[PDB]
RNA sequence: UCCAUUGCGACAACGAGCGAGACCCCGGCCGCGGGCGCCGCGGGACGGCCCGCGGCAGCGGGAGGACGGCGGGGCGAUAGCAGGUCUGUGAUGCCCUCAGACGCCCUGGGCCGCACGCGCGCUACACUGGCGGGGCCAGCCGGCGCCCGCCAGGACGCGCGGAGCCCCCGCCGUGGCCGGGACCGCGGGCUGGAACGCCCCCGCGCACCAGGAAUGUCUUGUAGGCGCCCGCCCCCACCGCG
């Protein structure tokens, strides 16, 4: 969806925020989109747009983090986008660190 | 050689009361104990005649500390596989000690006999936990590393 | 003068900036039983008996 | 059993004299001047080595029992390192012909019988091996 | 009739293979299906340098594909076990093969 | 217990009351091959048969690393060659050799800016250096000579036990101690 | 205080989050179930106990216990490098090229040359060793037989299977010697379409007798010694990964 928006020439912040809200409404505790490449410049930047809480390391990254990589193509040159979505409640398993405790 | 199910494959039945396992450095010994005349056999060979001629006393060491009379009246068939010669001499002394102790079982005499062995040599009746460590990339050795050419 | 043995009463600490010197208070095992402090190399512990070559020389207290 | 009760070396040496006295094997004398194993470099200095190797090979086939080990397997039992090269040394099998000659004599002698795949010790040969062992004891 | 049909279950994931085991044992328990014979795991391994180029201290990614295989023994009528295959829970990406 | 099925530990008591605690004959087992972990714990090393420590010191230089079976064979032949000449218990002659080969004074900087000062060698270090020096003098002596390792090891022990300066180990002790007396 | 913003006691801060830990793979120990094959599911260990010391967090021991205080790995914060890869890629901007091609093939040859400087390694410098027979010991994981050939290797078949070191007895015996095995002349094989590749047999017998100034790795199953497998691969490892 983000790749299409970027090819529709949506602003990178506008396109990324739209993807973030849809994931957050679907209940991801954190959504992070990183767009990297020559963003309207001959120098290369790496603007990362992130909201919520996203885990970074451990076996839970395999279970609770959906990491998707695209290579959207623009006229100036390839703009690679990574969308990372983390859901602690995926039904099948629980976060090891989280302790549910009791009343 | 690797913890295979081949206990009865060497010998069929023979009223082997116990089937102990003694393991040192990837070498396992299944020892079968029945009433006998004090004979002990390892790998279908007399225990006294063992390959490391220098370490042939280590194999007979549990018999000496416990006493020949207690050993008399037992026949042990030991099959050692895996590991190497010195560990196979350590595995059989451990297997003999565990198996002879099994005859006393939960008795107060066993508690004394376990203590008697544990005093002369501890870990004679207790497995040694040390096991080989893996090679890691950038070193020929498990922990050794390649020589740094610069810096 | 033959060396006189002395037993460690307290292991004061690790010195020489590489830790290899150990500071120990040693009470002469026999004789006047003076409690002097002497530098030691190696592994040392309480009740270790070491023969002091001169014993009339003592390291700075807890230094 | 028996061949185990007598140390392996004290049996092999006595059996070598026995297998030269009874006329068993009979050295080819063409393999007498050959060196067993590509691995070695200077050839056996024993001069009665064929008989020691012959008594050792029957003793192996006896402990094998119905395993029926092959001649190539016996060559891997006499494998050693090929030392004397700048490249690091590795294990190299023994000469197949020498062992093949030894097993051939036993089959003709009927000390060892032929079997599916490798040959194995015959009952008639086993009788000779165990009587010798108990006699040494 | 009465022949012996060898079922072999080859699966990459242990929990998935254990589930196939539960269904196969349950369907054939009446037909005297044998308890699972677990094969030594096939830990096929590829170790590759992490870098596309040769730059940096050479690092290595140790990838292991473990394949878990269960052999099953049932002796009975062939038609019943053909239906038994439909009855057992179907696990996607996990394969069963029958050899007489 | 008769080490090498020939020598008891009954008369083997160390006279040096400073070094007696760190030399142990109680744990002796015929054939010095106990696989007990001496590396574990700061002072578990002390509670080890002295003869086993010598058998661990003998296997050095890399070309001979790990071959305990060959080292303990040498210890037995060396002990027989000590029994043959000294005419005394060879476990007891080793105990006297370890006691003498150990220097009591060393030189270390002591928080100085290269200026070494006098220190006192610990009673465990005295035992560890003493055995190491015995084995290293023999090692150097047999490197290019028809004389076997067993013969030179037998002779350093026989020389150390009296205190003869021919022992590479006693010369080392007197050098270490003298540098310590001057740096005092 | 801790391996650690690891905690505790505080505190214009008050609540969070990421990394740390947890997690994951393996190992060792014990149950249960299964079994062509040891392989599936659980437990066990937590600084819990004891003694001292510490508001505390913990600390030093003693124990019991396969196992003791980060057992070894996998994963890897935040912000960057103008580090490297366009020759891994129907990844790719732009420039060049674009039928006398920078497409794609085909034969031959190079990359492997070499006054030399340097970085990994390998084998030695011997007697704790070399050389002859004999015993014989694994693990990642794994086919064999028979006959011929000095081996190398081959033919013809089939359904299978296993190390060095070390131990034991001889020999040489301090001699650049039988240490060492570089070179170099015939010869025997192999693989492929083709050697210049590899293997092997009798020669041949180099330095090196322990390495200056420097410098590197390592605390238990570790160093080191000693084999073995796999990756690439017609053949080929002094390499890497196990």
Task: Note down, in words, how this protein is organized.
The structure is cut from a larger assembly and holds chains A (103 residues), B (151 residues), C (63 residues), D (137 residues), E (100 residues) and F (184 residues). Chain B is α+β, with helices and mostly antiparallel strands and 151 residues long. Chain B is built from five helices and four strands; from the N terminus they run αβββααβαα. Chain B has one domain (17-151). In chain B, strands 1-2-4-3 form a four-stranded mixed sheet. In chain B, strand 1 (18-24) and strand 2 form a beta hairpin. With 63 residues, chain C is an all-beta fold. Chain C contains no helices and four strands. Chain C starts with a strand and ends in an 11-residue tail after the last strand. Chain E has two helices and five strands; from the N terminus they run βαβββαβ. Chain E has one domain. In chain E, strands 1, 2, 3, 4 and 5 form a five-stranded antiparallel sheet that branches. Chains in contact: B-D, B-E, B-F, C-F. Chain C binds chain F through residues 3, 5, 15-17, 20-22, 38-45, 48-54, 57, 59, 63, and chain F through 17-18, 21, 42-43, 104-106, 108-111, 117-126, 128, 177, 180-181, 184. Chain D binds one RNA strand of 242 nucleotides through helix 1, helix 2, helix 3, strand 1 and helix 4. Chain B: Belongs to the universal ribosomal protein uS9 family.
Topology, pairings included?
The structure is cut from a larger assembly and holds chains A (103 residues), B (151 residues), C (63 residues), D (137 residues), E (100 residues) and F (184 residues).
Chain B: H1 7-10, E1 18-24, E2 27-35, E3 40-42, H2 56-66, H3 68-71, E4 74-82, H4 85-104, H5 108-120
Parallel strand pairs in B: 3-4
Antiparallel strand pairs in B: 1-2, 2-4
Chain C: E1 4-15, E2 21-28, E3 35-41, E4 49-52
Antiparallel strand pairs in C: 1-2, 1-4, 2-3
Chain E: E1 3-11, H1 14-28, E2 37-38, E3 42-49, E4 60-76, H2 78-87, E5 95-99
Antiparallel strand pairs in E: 1-4, 1-5, 2-4, 3-4
Chain D binds one RNA strand of 242 nucleotides through residues 7-9, 12-13, 31, 33-38, 40-46, 49, 52-53, 56, 68, 70-73, 76-81, 83-91, 95-97, 100, 104, 114, 116-119.
Protein name (chain C): Ribosomal protein S28
GO molecular function, one term (chain C): structural constituent of ribosome
Organism (chain C): Giardia intestinalis (strain ATCC 50803 / WB clone C6) (Giardia lamblia)
Q: What labels would you give this structure?
A:
part of a larger assembly; 6 chains; E: 100 residues; alpha+beta; 5-stranded antiparallel β-sheet; 5 strands; 25% helix; F: 184 residues; mainly alpha; two-stranded antiparallel sheet; 2 strands; 47% helix; RNA-binding; ribosomal protein (chain C); Ribosomal_eS28 (chain C)
Structural class of chain E: alpha+beta
Secondary-structure element order of chain E, as H and E? EHEEEHE
Rough outline of chain E:
elongated
How many helix segments of chain E? 2
PDB class: ribosome
Keywords: Ribosome, Translation, Giardia, Eukaryote, Eukaryotic, Macromolecule, tRNA
Entry title: Giardia ribosome in POST-T state (A1)
Chain A: Ribosomal protein S3
